[PDB]
């Protein structure tokens, strides 16, 4: 999927990503961070993958090492449909806003002062990216 | 270097919209489109005051690392310290570039691209949003 670099997203700004969830989607990923080996956020909604049904799985990656994984409480995504995710962050946490008025915070484990990398994988085609 | 995006997958007939902020003391900026960084269907280079050119848009392509013959446009609907949006589509024969103030120009699809998968911004132009 889409790979963007030099995003230079800073605290106080909002990264908006809108796209299309494939009609027969099994899962999709949104990775954010410094680069492919340093992710402040691995956002992985699973419709049906690795034995999981309708669950968002999140984690970080530091120097290539995956951190402690966690399943989120909600799943506001549907196969074959439009969905927008919005991310902001500060020194301590990332805030992830999801469809249907849901949102959750994820610890800023890497202590990132900026987000410069984003990569989409799986059954999700990004159609629009906005800053602020 | 500004935002760099790959795996865009822009198909013929689809419109790529790029909106950004022209810096207050902008000398020039670049929008590169193509297959990848070495194969550009469009090097879009508005020059406010650079390389001896004043308020002039210069375009060219790059094929396998080789720059083609540069092309000068006849309009310059840009001004430092403001927002500007450019829209691009293509077919087999030309790309069509739509500029502010209702201006537009065509550039030959020299590399015969059937998709645009790469986009990069450079210079005094900060991308606020990209849609495709």
Swiss-Prot record, chain A:
The keyword Acetylation applies. It comes from Homo sapiens (Human). This is Galectin-1. It is found in: Secreted, Extracellular space, Extracellular matrix; Cytoplasm; Secreted. Homodimer. Binds LGALS3BP. Interacts with CD2, CD3, CD4, CD6, CD7, CD43, ALCAM and CD45. Interacts with laminin (via poly-N-acetyllactosamine). Interacts with SUSD2. Interacts with cargo receptor TMED10; the interaction mediates the translocation from the cytoplasm into the ERGIC (endoplasmic reticulum-Golgi intermediate compartment) and thereby secretion. Interacts with CD69. Its main location: secreted. Residues 1-132 form the Galectin domain. One of its GO terms (cellular component) is cytosol. GO terms for biological process: apoptotic process; cell-cell adhesion; myoblast differentiation; negative regulation of T-helper 17 cell lineage commitment; plasma cell differentiation; positive regulation of apoptotic process; positive regulation of canonical NF-kappaB signal transduction; positive regulation of inflammatory response. InterPro entries: ConA-like_dom_sf, Galectin-like, Galectin_CRD.
UniProtKB/Swiss-Prot annotation, chain B:
The modification N6-acetyllysine is found at residues 11, 27, 106, 126. SUPFAM superfamilies: Concanavalin A-like lectins/glucanases. The keyword Translocase does not apply. Keywords: Acetylation, Apoptosis, Cytoplasm, Extracellular matrix, Lectin, Phosphoprotein, Secreted. One of its GO terms (biological process) is positive regulation of viral entry into host cell. It comes from the Eukaryota. The modification Phosphoserine is found at residue 28. Expressed in placenta, maternal decidua and fetal membranes. Within placenta, expressed in trophoblasts, stromal cells, villous endothelium, syncytiotrophoblast apical membrane and villous stroma. Within fetal membranes, expressed in amnion, chorioamniotic mesenchyma and chorion (at protein level). Expressed in cardiac, smooth, and skeletal muscle, neurons, thymus, kidney and hematopoietic cells. Signal peptide: none annotated. Pfam families: Gal-bind_lectin (PF00337). It is found in: Secreted, Extracellular space, Extracellular matrix; Cytoplasm; Secreted. A beta-D-galactoside binds at residues 43-47, 51, 60, 67-70. One of its GO terms (molecular function) is RNA binding. Lectin that binds beta-galactoside and a wide array of complex carbohydrates. Plays a role in regulating apoptosis, cell proliferation and cell differentiation. Inhibits CD45 protein phosphatase activity and therefore the dephosphorylation of Lyn kinase. Strong inducer of T-cell apoptosis. Plays a negative role in Th17 cell differentiation via activation of the receptor CD69. Homodimer. Binds LGALS3BP. Interacts with CD2, CD3, CD4, CD6, CD7, CD43, ALCAM and CD45. Interacts with laminin (via poly-N-acetyllactosamine). Interacts with SUSD2. Interacts with cargo receptor TMED10; the interaction mediates the translocation from the cytoplasm into the ERGIC (endoplasmic reticulum-Golgi intermediate compartment) and thereby secretion. Interacts with CD69. This is Galectin-1. It comes from Homo sapiens (Human). The lineage of its organism: Eukaryota, Metazoa, Chordata, Craniata, Vertebrata.
């Amino acid at each position: 999927g889409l790979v963007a670099s030099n995003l230079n997203l800073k605290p106080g700004e909002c990264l908006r990503v809108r796209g299309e969830v494939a009609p027969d989607a099994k899962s999709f990923v949104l990775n954010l961070g410094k680069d492919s080996n340093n992710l402040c956020l691995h956002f992985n909604p699973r419709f049906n993958a690795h034995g999981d049904a309708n669950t968002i799985v999140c984690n970080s990656k530091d120097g290539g090492a995956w951190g402690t994984e966690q399943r989120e409480a909600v799943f506001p995504f549907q196969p074959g449909s439009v969905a927008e995710v919005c991310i902001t962050f500060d020194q301590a946490n990332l805030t992830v806003k999801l469809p249907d008025g849901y949102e959750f915070k994820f610890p800023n484990r890497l202590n990132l002062e900026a987000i410069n990398y984003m990569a989409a994988d799986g059954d999700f085609k990004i159609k629009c990216v906005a800053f602020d």
